[PDB]
């Protein structure tokens, strides 16, 4: 049986097709990026509001890290 | 004192004179006696010496 549906390869298969630990570093960075991004409402905001929330969080983290030391 | 309360529902408004009058006019009573079965029992009166 055959139809007119074009399929989309899985990301694992795409990495298999395209072929050290630089990949591991990249994937841990992207894991952290997604984990931070999806749990805060950035998809539901505009650009200016998202930028201001970003700088707000960055300032909080920087101040907290400075105080901790 | 605040933690002791019981959880009541806000009190309602009392009825109005026009409402009372309409409710009273809606009520219908029964007759003093029951005239339904008088005729099939009234042979007792007719057979009394």
């Amino acid at each position: 049986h055959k139809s007119s549906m074009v399929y989309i390869p899985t990301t694992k298969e795409a990495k298999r097709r395209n072929g050290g630990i630089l990949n591991t570093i990249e994937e841990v960075v992207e894991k952290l990026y997604w984990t931070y991004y999806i749990h805060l409402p950035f998809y539901l905001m505009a650009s200016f509001d998202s930028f201001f929330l970003h700088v707000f969080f960055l300032t909080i983290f920087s101040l907290s890290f400075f105080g901790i030391l | 004192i605040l933690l002791t309360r019981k959880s009541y529902k806000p009190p309602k408004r009392p009825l109005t004179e026009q409402e009372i009058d309409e409710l009273c006019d809606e009520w219908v009573p029964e007759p003093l006696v029951d005239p339904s079965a008088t005729d099939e029992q009234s042979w007792r009166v007719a057979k009394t010496p």
Binding site: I60, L63, S64, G67 | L2, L3, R5, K6, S7, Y8, K9, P10
Partner: protein, 149 residues
Amino acid sequence: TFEDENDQQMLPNMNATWVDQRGAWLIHIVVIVLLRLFYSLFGSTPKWTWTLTNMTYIIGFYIMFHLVKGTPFDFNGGAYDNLTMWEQINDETLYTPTRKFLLIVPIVLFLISNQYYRNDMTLFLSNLAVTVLIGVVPKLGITHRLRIS
């Protein structure tokens, strides 16, 4: 009236049903704690941080639960057009567990904050005034549906 009550009963009010769900009692405490740590991160003296925490929480709660009348979306003809969100909780039934918990929170918050600005009469008086005048009075059982000018 009759139609009004039937409309108010015909649907669960999605504007005021989320309170009795899984984790609101805890989110109140969580946001209090977060505000405390934020004001600590500012860096000023503890009394200023605690009075700022108390004012911020109380004013936010008042502006959200007590200022706006109606629903943010269509519910019925009007139904709840002249009621704030605090007057809609548990379909107008006073002193339910949720209301008790929301009443207790400001008092305990003041009790915890008390032992840091006790030495200053100005801050103590202002904190007590704001607390008892904004966080306990509108939530009372005699202020329900009390409209003034």
